[PDB]
Amino acid sequence: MTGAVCPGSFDPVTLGHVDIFERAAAQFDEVVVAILVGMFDLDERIAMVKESTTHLPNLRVQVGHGLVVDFVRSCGMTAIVKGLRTGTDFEYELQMAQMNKHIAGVDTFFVATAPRYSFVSSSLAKEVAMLGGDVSELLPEPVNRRLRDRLN
Amino acid sequence: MTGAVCPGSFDPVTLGHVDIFERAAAQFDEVVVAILVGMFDLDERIAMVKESTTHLPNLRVQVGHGLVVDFVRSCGMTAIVKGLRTGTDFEYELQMAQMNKHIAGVDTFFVATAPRYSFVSSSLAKEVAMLGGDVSELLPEPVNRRLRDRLN
Amino acid sequence: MTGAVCPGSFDPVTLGHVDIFERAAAQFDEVVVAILVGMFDLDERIAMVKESTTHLPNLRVQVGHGLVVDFVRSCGMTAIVKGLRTGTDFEYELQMAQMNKHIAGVDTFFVATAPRYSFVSSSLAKEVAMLGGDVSELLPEPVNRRLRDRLN
Amino acid sequence: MTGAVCPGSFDPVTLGHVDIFERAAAQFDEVVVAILVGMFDLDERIAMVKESTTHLPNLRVQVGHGLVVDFVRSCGMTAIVKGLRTGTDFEYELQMAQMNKHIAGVDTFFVATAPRYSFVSSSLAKEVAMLGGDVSELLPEPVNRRLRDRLN
Amino acid sequence: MTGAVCPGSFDPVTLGHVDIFERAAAQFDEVVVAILVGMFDLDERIAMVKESTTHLPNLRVQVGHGLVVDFVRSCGMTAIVKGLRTGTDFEYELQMAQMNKHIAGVDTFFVATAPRYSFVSSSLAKEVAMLGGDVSELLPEPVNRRLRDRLN
Amino acid sequence: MTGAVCPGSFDPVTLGHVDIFERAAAQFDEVVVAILVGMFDLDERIAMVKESTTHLPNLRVQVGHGLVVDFVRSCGMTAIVKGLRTGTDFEYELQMAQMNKHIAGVDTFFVATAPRYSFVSSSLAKEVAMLGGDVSELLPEPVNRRLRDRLN
Ligand SMILES: O=C(O)CCc1c[nH]c2ccccc12
Ligand SMILES: O=C(O)CCc1c[nH]c2ccccc12
Ligand SMILES: O=C(O)CCc1c[nH]c2ccccc12
Ligand SMILES: O=C(O)CCc1c[nH]c2ccccc12
Ligand SMILES: O=C(O)CCc1c[nH]c2ccccc12
Numbered sequence: 001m002t003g004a005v006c007p008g009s010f011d012p013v014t015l016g017h018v019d020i021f022e023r024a025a026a027q028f029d030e031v032v033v034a035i036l037v038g039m040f041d042l043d044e045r046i047a048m049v050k051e052s053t054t055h056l057p058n059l060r061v062q063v064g065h066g067l068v069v070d071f072v073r074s075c076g077m078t079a080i081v082k083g084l085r086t087g088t089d090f091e092y093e094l095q096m097a098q099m100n101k102h103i104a105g106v107d108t109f110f111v112a113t114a115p116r117y118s119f120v121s122s123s124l125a126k127e128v129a130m131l132g133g134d135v136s137e138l139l140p141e142p143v144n145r146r147l148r149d150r151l152n
Numbered sequence: 153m154t155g156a157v158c159p160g161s162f163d164p165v166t167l168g169h170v171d172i173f174e175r176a177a178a179q180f181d182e183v184v185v186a187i188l189v190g191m192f193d194l195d196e197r198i199a200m201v202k203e204s205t206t207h208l209p210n211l212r213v214q215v216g217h218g219l220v221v222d223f224v225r226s227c228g229m230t231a232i233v234k235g236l237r238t239g240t241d242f243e244y245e246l247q248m249a250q251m252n253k254h255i256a257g258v259d260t261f262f263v264a265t266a267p268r269y270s271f272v273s274s275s276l277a278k279e280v281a282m283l284g285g286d287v288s289e290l291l292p293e294p295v296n297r298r299l300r301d302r303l304n
Numbered sequence: 305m306t307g308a309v310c311p312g313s314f315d316p317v318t319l320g321h322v323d324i325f326e327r328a329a330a331q332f333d334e335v336v337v338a339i340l341v342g343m344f345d346l347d348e349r350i351a352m353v354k355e356s357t358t359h360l361p362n363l364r365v366q367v368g369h370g371l372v373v374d375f376v377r378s379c380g381m382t383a384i385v386k387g388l389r390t391g392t393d394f395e396y397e398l399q400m401a402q403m404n405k406h407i408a409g410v411d412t413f414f415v416a417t418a419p420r421y422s423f424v425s426s427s428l429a430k431e432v433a434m435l436g437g438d439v440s441e442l443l444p445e446p447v448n449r450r451l452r453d454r455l456n
Numbered sequence: 457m458t459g460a461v462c463p464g465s466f467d468p469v470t471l472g473h474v475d476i477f478e479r480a481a482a483q484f485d486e487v488v489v490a491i492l493v494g495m496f497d498l499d500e501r502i503a504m505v506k507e508s509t510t511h512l513p514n515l516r517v518q519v520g521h522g523l524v525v526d527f528v529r530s531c532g533m534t535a536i537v538k539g540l541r542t543g544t545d546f547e548y549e550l551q552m553a554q555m556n557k558h559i560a561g562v563d564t565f566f567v568a569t570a571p572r573y574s575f576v577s578s579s580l581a582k583e584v585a586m587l588g589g590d591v592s593e594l595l596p597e598p599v600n601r602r603l604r605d606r607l608n
Numbered sequence: 609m610t611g612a613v614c615p616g617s618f619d620p621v622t623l624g625h626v627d628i629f630e631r632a633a634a635q636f637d638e639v640v641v642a643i644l645v646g647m648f649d650l651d652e653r654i655a656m657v658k659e660s661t662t663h664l665p666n667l668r669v670q671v672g673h674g675l676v677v678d679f680v681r682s683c684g685m686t687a688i689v690k691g692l693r694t695g696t697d698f699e700y701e702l703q704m705a706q707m708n709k710h711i712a713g714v715d716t717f718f719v720a721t722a723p724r725y726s727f728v729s730s731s732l733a734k735e736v737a738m739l740g741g742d743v744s745e746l747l748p749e750p751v752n753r754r755l756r757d758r759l760n
Numbered sequence: 761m762t763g764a765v766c767p768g769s770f771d772p773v774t775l776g777h778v779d780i781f782e783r784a785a786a787q788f789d790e791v792v793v794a795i796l797v798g799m800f801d802l803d804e805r806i807a808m809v810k811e812s813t814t815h816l817p818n819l820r821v822q823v824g825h826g827l828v829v830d831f832v833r834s835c836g837m838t839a840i841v842k843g844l845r846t847g848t849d850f851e852y853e854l855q856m857a858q859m860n861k862h863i864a865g866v867d868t869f870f871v872a873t874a875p876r877y878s879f880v881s882s883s884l885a886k887e888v889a890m891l892g893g894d895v896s897e898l899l900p901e902p903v904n905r906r907l908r909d910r911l912n
């Protein structure tokens with residue numbers, strides 16, 4: 001039984017994130033989205049991920065605390081899957097990947113997000129949305145709905 | 153009628169900035185320096201840019217608020233011009249450039265600052281100036297004057 | 305009168321190139337595509353660029369020889385416009401940009417290609433096309449037609 | 457049934473490669489090492505990979521021709537797994553990864569090699585070995601044996 | 609008489625730092641570790657560096673204030689030696705190196721830390737140690753001892 | 761007795777190279793410029809380095825063959841000093857630096873060339889000089905003289 005953990009704050013989840021979830025879900029038996037304790041509270045973040053991943057029956061959403069590698073090992077896996085996008089601090093991701101292999105033997109697999117979703121990030125989406133800009137093509141509809149409510 | 157916006161906080165403007173202003177002014181009909189709301193207050197920042205750009209008759213200085221692309225489109229342009237220097241977070245600039253094209257159709261043109269001004273930044277100039285170091289060859293004289301006054 | 309030169313081998317021109325041509329054409333009075341002396345011969349390359357740029361009335365195609373900056377200065381301009389894509393050797397582009405400013409005072413403006421065209425290059429398109437892969441969504445139809453003929 | 461292809465020339469295979477093979481083999485049901493048509497001939501390359509991977513029962517070695525994505529799809533998989541090391545041209549790997557997703561829907565997962573094997577590459581190992589240097593701690597013993605024979 | 613300054617906050621010193629100290633100590637007549645004013649207080653930081661460098665008789669530990677280049681010049685040297693690791697912001701280090709040469713004529717020499725210590729940093733070690741992870745193989749024993757005490 | 765080797769092809773030596781030689785010569789007891797076996801023949805390359813370094817009495821020029829680390833160790837040193845400029849393939853330099861430490865225990869120190877000489881390289885200088893461009897401000901006069909002769 002193989003399994004990947006996709007860790008993050010997901011505040012909010014973007015279509016870049018969902019693209020990675022989909023690719024992980026297609027290559028591993030189970031995928032766990034670990035929401036790592038912002039604009040939205042924990043329960044909203046969970047809801048937004050769930051609502052955006054109903055098409056992925058082997059995907060599961062869970063709150064995580066502490067080291068990602070602890071979460072991974074407790075849940076019975078040894079793989080982390082993370083996306084790459086424009087603006088990713090890859091050097092820091094690499095540093096963490098090597099540290100995570102060192103302390104817990106967990107591998108990290110990096111996958112590039114699709115070009116169309118390669119420039120969205122949670123932070124930039126929020127900042128642009130707060131200043132009036134339309135990022136709805138870059139976020140799941142469950143997120144757009146909640147984003148709209150707050151702006152109103 | 154073509155036009156470029158050069159956006160930034162300009163706290164203070166450096167000769168790296170002025171180098172870019174000069175290159176934009178030579179290639180576009182109008183250049184607008186948008187001061188985006190630090191050490192110097194808004195009026196000082198404006199004054200320092202104006203005083204340092206008297207040799208650029210098609211350049212105009214204006215305070216901006218909100219999204220740069222909104223500023224650009226309201227002022228009747230669709231081009232942003234930004235400089236590159238050592239320490240520029242280019243991946244983040246790229247992310248913003250793609251986001252800005254997405255939401256408003258605005259293009260961003262990047263130009264490398266001259267080598268002699270390639271290692272000055274507003275932040276580093278301030279920090280070095282506060283700790284006693286001489287950065288006067290890297291800043292316009294209007295900035296040096298104001299910088300000197302505060303240190304005294 | 306402002307003018308940009310877009311230099312390259314264009315063997316063949318891609319939709320990444322055309323994206324840059326379009327953005328240059330919208331910001332400068334004249335754009336000259338300089339085809340710098342492969343799979344297609346010079347006349348085919350010229351034809352493919354012309355056929356792919358009929359919607360750009362201020363764009364002009366010309367063969368170039370020697371230094372780009374010489375071409376730029378002889379044609380009455382001082383700006384080069386180049387695109388950035390995934391796999392661009394940007395450090396080398398920067399080196400050339402600084403060298404070109406040094407020897408001839410010519411500025412180079414870099415613009416990111418649209419995400420959807422950010423992973424095509426002339427070389428990779430050819431290599432993929434030769435090994436059977438379908439890159440037709442990444443190239444102008446004038447190029448696809450000629451590409452098809454040779455493969456047959 | 458999940459499966460990863462690890463493509464390359466493997467001329468010769470290094471312990472950096474074997475590190476990646478091991479991590480792929482632990483996360484996928486099947487791993488296929490595709491030797492993509494140098495110093496060693498095809499049969500030696502195959503032999504060296506086989507001899508260095510006897511501890512990986514779900515790993516299989518095969519010669520490949522043409523597009524990696526064709527190989528992947530014909531063999532019934534949709535994942536490529538590639539390692540990262542110091543000197544990897546990651547921008548080009550990213551370009552190929554996006555092109556490969558475009559033409560065939562195949563995902564590419566990148567994993568960092570262990571630090572101790574992060575500076576070996578086939579090319580550098582050969583060049584150093586030819587000029588007298590000892591790289592035996594960076595290569596499998598099956599490779600060292602064959603490397604020694606040729607130098608003698 | 610030649611001399612290198614190795615500046616930093618060293619909160620705490622890591623084996624990556626000690627690796628660089630050792631390489632500097634072997635190439636310069638004197639090495640000064642400048643602790644630049646966190647988790648540990650100044651006196652603990654000093655103690656931890658001293659205790660970890662007893663094998664380096666030409667190495668000296670000193671608190672520093674203000675510009676590194678001022679410290680360097682006052683102490684009778686003109687060289688800074690800094691390490692590189694995974695996650696180093698090298699572009700910012702380069703910017704500072706050029707600024708430091710500009711204002712004070714001081715050269716900065718960069719050396720890569722050993723691969724085995726290439727993913728430790730003071731910040732990441734602390735964060736991992738606080739969340740329960742074992743980083744003891746990446747830190748001097750004098751640091752491990754003090755780290756253990758606080759966690760208990 | 762401390763010593764640095766500055767290895768390269770130096771075809772021809774540039775003022776970027778001489779800048780690095782000067783900084784090495786000021787920090788080490790002896791500097792050996794190792795010319796590693798182009799446009800100029802070995803004897804011209806030697807002559808050009810010598811003629812450009814008469815102001816550096818502790819600098820010595822020598823032809824080298826094989827591994828740089830062999831040269832370094834035979835000459836009684838354990839340090840390599842290399843410059844960084846715009847267009848340097850730093851990832852490959854890092855790979856070689858780690859390989860060189862591995863096989864022979866030799867450290868490599870990297871130093872940034874001055875901004876004014878940061879965009880010259882032997883290759884680009886030659887190519888620009890062949891196509892008519894004036895790079896004389898970027899090369900020693902001994903090189904300019906020889907460069908002029910060949911062009912005539
Ligand atoms: O950076 C992003 O916002 C998108 C990619 C990304 C970062 N961490 C991730 C974790 C899981 C899936 C995707 C990601
Ligand atoms: O980074 C800098 O400080 C100099 C380059 C720079 C950033 N934003 C800019 C906007 C306009 C002109 C120049 C710049
Ligand atoms: O690299 C590419 O193939 C696309 C971007 C590109 C490089 N040189 C260019 C010149 C003009 C317009 C675009 C480009
Ligand atoms: O670059 C290397 O030599 C090691 C990493 C590497 C490149 N392609 C690979 C394919 C499969 C497994 C590992 C790799
Ligand atoms: O980044 C690190 O933590 C290790 C490398 C490093 C940064 N500054 C340094 C100063 C002296 C010696 C080593 C270093």
Ligand SMILES: O=C(O)CCc1c[nH]c2ccccc12
Nearest residue numbers: 766767776777780842843881
């Ligand atoms: O790259 C360059 O041409 C200049 C920097 C450089 C590379 N190798 C070098 C060796 C010694 C001194 C300087 C250098």
